């Protein structure tokens, strides 16, 4: 996160750390959607141009964390993965279309003050909240600049109109993506950055006061550049695939 601020304790309890066993390293963000399921960006697992291909065995998940580097001795829960599922039409070859993956935890986690799942949007919630101008919230432990924070970072960013998104890059945008950030004119800034992928883009419903995951941190070009925007996987749109895997496994 660039131009964000230190989260408050318990602010984003669905926030998960994607952790490499050896070398020990922060890989990405992720989010807790149930006591057994974690959502993340498929490119955190699989990205062949960079020779990245991780397996169940390559990783750990750390839940209820605040500090990046400290072992949060009676707060955080570390869990092993049982199974990784990547969207079958995830497009690593061209544009990260469908950048989404599910991780099934070995044993379920116990929810606490620091551990709690986020809601998945419904057709109706998506419809009302996913509008240009409406702000969402991004969290993560990624780069502070185009570096590593000591505590979880947060930033509030507005959704941007499709055409503006399109005109900002040479990358082919698809309906499975949305962009967000401030316009240079708006002179307010901030963005996700490398190490932030898989982190949730969340909105708070004004109807029922619940937090919903609308996005997943996917890609960008640079971090917090004027005229550029963060791109996110559109969760509602990949909803049936998510349902489909949980209903099957």
């Amino acid at each position: 996160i660039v131009e964000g601020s230190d989260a408050e304790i318990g602010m984003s309890p669905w926030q998960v750390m994607l952790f490499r066993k050896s070398p020990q390293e922060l890989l990405c963000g992720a989010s807790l959607i149930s006591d057994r399921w974690v959502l993340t960006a498929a490119h955190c697992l699989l990205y062949p141009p960079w020779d990245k291909n991780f397996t169940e065995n390559d990783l750990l998940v750390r839940i209820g964390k605040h500090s990046r580097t400290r072992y949060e001795r009676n707060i955080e829960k570390i869990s092993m993965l049982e199974k990784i599922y990547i969207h079958p039409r995830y497009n690593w070859r061209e544009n990260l279309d469908r950048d989404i993956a599910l991780m099934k935890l070995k044993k379920p986690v116990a929810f606490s003050d620091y551990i709690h799942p986020v809601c998945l949007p419904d057709r109706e919630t998506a419809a009302s909240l996913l509008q240009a101008g409406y702000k969402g919230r991004v969290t993560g432990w990624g780069n502070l600049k185009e570096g590593q924070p000591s505590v979880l970072q947060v930033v509030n960013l507005p959704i941007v109109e499709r055409p503006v998104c399109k005109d900002s890059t040479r990358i082919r945008i698809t309906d499975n993506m949305f962009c967000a950030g401030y316009k240079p004119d708006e002179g307010k800034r901030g963005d996700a950055c490398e190490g932030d992928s898989g982190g949730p883009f969340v909105m708070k419903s004004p109807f029922n006061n619940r937090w919903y995951q609308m996005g997943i941190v996917s890609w960008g070009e640079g971090c917090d550049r004027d005229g550029k925007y963060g791109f996110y996987t559109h969760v509602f749109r990949l909803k049936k695939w998510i349902q489909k895997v949980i209903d099957q496994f």
Binding site: E8, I9, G10, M11, P13, I33, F111, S112, D113, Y114, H116, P117, V118, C119, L120, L129, G133, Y134, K135, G136, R137, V154, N156, P158, M203, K204, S205, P206, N209, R210, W211, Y212
Partner: peptide, 26 residues
Amino acid sequence: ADCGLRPLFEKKSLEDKTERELLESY
């Protein structure tokens, strides 16, 4: 079920420092 309702905030009727910024945008 209980999703999206934070034990230290919603549950206790406490607001975090910048959630008003989101609701004001809607």
